[PDB]
Each structure stands twice: as C-alpha cells, then as structure tokens.
C-alpha cells in the first residue's frame, strides 16, 4: 500500500504477453490485484498482475507492447503500489478498440467474425485494467493482433481508465 | 608380394646395427631399405583397398625416414599417408598432415607448406567441421603465399578466411579482410572486375553496425553506371542500407527478392542477409 521498489524485467512465456498483464512473483503479489506503476514524478500507469513461478522476487515483468506504451526499459527501477478500482463508477460497459494485425508478416484477407472476437475477448480479459490509448495484443484463433483502446464508457460517462467485467460489451 | 611379410622384414632390418652385423660401416643404408619395404607394403595395402592399413604403413615408412636424416622425401611420405587416410575409413589424415607441415616449415619449404596448409584447413572444415582451427590455418597460410610474392593465392586464402569468419559471427574481422583484399586487388586490372563482391561483402558484414560503416564502404566504391557489372554490388546495397536505417523489414526483404532476380543469391549471402533481416525486426520491436 505504501508502494515498494521493483525492477522491470521481461515477460516469461508468450501467453502472459498476450494477456497484457504485469507478470510478477507469488512471493510479492497475488493474481487478481491491480497496481500503479510509478516511473517519474509525473508518469502514472495502471496494470493487472498475474503471478508465475518464473518471476524473480523483487521485479515485475512486462511485455514489449507494454514497454512501448508505459515507456519502460528492461533494468530500470520503478515503484509499484496496490490500486483498487471503483466498480461503482469505473466499470467498463462499452469500450471501443482499434484492432489490427500484430505481426505484420501475418495478415490475410479472410473475414473474422467480430461476435466471436468480443466473446473470447472478455473470456480472457475479464477483471482487468484498460486505459485509453493503451497498446496490447490479442490472440484470436492462435492469431496475434494489435489492439488499441480509443474510448471507454461506464455502465453513459466517459472514463480515462476502467475495469472490464463479465457483462462488458466490446466494439 | 606379401604385405605382412614385408612389414616383418622391414622390422628385422630397421635397427642400429652392431657387432658382426655393423661390420665397418652402416646406418642410414639399412633404415632406407626398410622405408622402401613399408612403402611397398602400403602400396599393396592400397592395392587390396585396405587403405587404413596402407596409411599406417606409410606412417611407419615416414617415421623411419626421419630416423635416417631426410626430412624432405619424408614429409612427402607423410603427405601420401594423409591422402590414404583421407580416402580411407580412419580419421588420422589431419595428424599426418600436421606432421608434414612441421617439416616443410622447419626446412623452409614455405611454398609447399602453404600449398598443403590450405588443404589442411580445407579438411578441418569439410571433415572435422572445426572452422575455429580452419580459419587459423587459412590465415597463417595466406601469410606465406603473400610472402612468396604470390598475391593471387594469398587472396584465395584470404577469401576463405573472411568468408568463413562472417559465418562464425566475426563480421568486423571480416570487413577488414575485405577492405585489404580490395585495395590489394586494384593493382591488377585483371581483378578490378571482381573487386565489387569484396565491397558488397564488406558492406554487408555488420558488427551490429548502427551508422554508416557500410554506407561508407559503398561510397568509397567507384561505380560506373555504364559499367554494368557493378549492378551486382552497390546499387542493391544502397537500397538495403535504406531499408535498414528505416526499420523496414519489407523494403529489405523485397529488395533481396528483386536482387535475387537479376543476381542469384548464394548460400553465404542468404545466411547473412537473413541475419541483417532480423537485426531490423528486433529494432522494430524494441
């Protein structure tokens, strides 16, 4: 709660890097808790934790997409503090997302049903933090894509950062 | 005509005489006859296609020849032994060859020492697959050639050195070799023509290059648009340098596809091109 010191690391496997979650150790936090990264006296971001037996105590692993977003480097010192959302006014009911093909070298003309996408989206990104302008990756049918939150609405006000729940619609 | 028998007689005569055998004089006169024996033996061993046997036989004849004081025709025997083991089932070859050079080198016969030296590393690369020991030889050998005024051969060797040095990751240590073999190739208007590939390689090799080391090797280059030969060197290079400096693993990978049209990419090129192909991707993804 007082915010401790940590060290930026690299994402363990290629599965947690597709969940847009800050992989940490079990000796530090627990899967399900939210935190707020603190790099500079003016830079504040919000991520979702997900423990893994591959993480080293005293460090948080981030994926490339998260690095290019939060401007984090591999080996820098940062402060992590627990953060509890206000499900009474921050829940995401409708969040528009700019989707494209992640691995450029993997783009086709085949049509993708959105309904099936928004279904596998919440079934994997449920109870997580998403900010406006955040960059991550989506895996639909073993296919990597590049998402980009543009707008988020409450469940209709407009919020900067929200929490995706079960009954969260995605466009 | 019995190899086994010859191998026996040779023994019974290869021993410093003394007493009633020595008489008044002797020594080298006997050991030489013995060498001729083992040689005849290895000869029929190779006749029966026992090679391995022929090789070890030559090893005996050679070793004996040293015990006589005749390093020359001895080392030549070591060579024969190497040709035998090489076209045989054992691996020995390498050994014999080394034992050959030590002679040609100590004797001063560097010309032939290098003549074989190149074959040495050529085997330590096509057989033992030990490039780390192959390059050392291609190099030490090129030094001898370059010393025997023989520039052409020295360059053949250097080409081997640099060529395999880039495969091992030694990129900078390769470009240096290409630069040198490039400035020492223009003194012969009978080589200018090929001097291209040199610049192409030296500019392709990148020791994690970040700036214009290659842009500089391509600018030093004197291309003559009306000298169409150059179309297989710089023209492409410039387009690749741009596709690199602009983190575009498409313009580069497209240029490799196009150039691969006007000019077939060989093994080497392919391998390195792919290495540079990934230096861009990782940079697009940082």
Characterize the structure shown.
The structure is cut from a larger assembly and holds chains A (171 residues) and B (286 residues). Helix content of chain A is 9%, strand content 38%. The N and C termini of chain A lie far apart (35 Å). By secondary structure, chain A is mostly beta strands. Chain A is built from two helices and eleven strands. The longest helix of chain A has 9 residues, at 114-122. Chain A has helices at residues 64-70, 114-122, and strands spanning 4-10, 34-38, 44-48, 60-62, 77-82, 91-97, 100-101, 128-131, 135-139, 144-154, 161-170. In chain A, a hairpin with a 4-residue loop joins strand 9 and strand 10. In chain A, the strands form two sheets. In chain A, strands 6, 7, 8, 9, 10 and 11 form a six-stranded mixed sheet that branches. In chain A, strands 3-2-5-1-4 form a five-stranded mixed sheet. Chain B is mostly helical and 286 residues long. Chain B is 69% helix and 0% strand. Chain B has helices at residues 3-13, 28-47, 52-66, 71-86, 94-107, 110-126, 131-147, 151-167, 172-183, 195-204, 213-219, 234-245, 251-262, 267-284. The radius of gyration of chain B is 26 Å and the shape is elongated. Chain B starts with a helix and ends with a helix. The chains are: A mainly beta (171), B mainly alpha (286). Chain A binds chain B through residues 64, 104-105, and chain B through 249-250, 285-286.
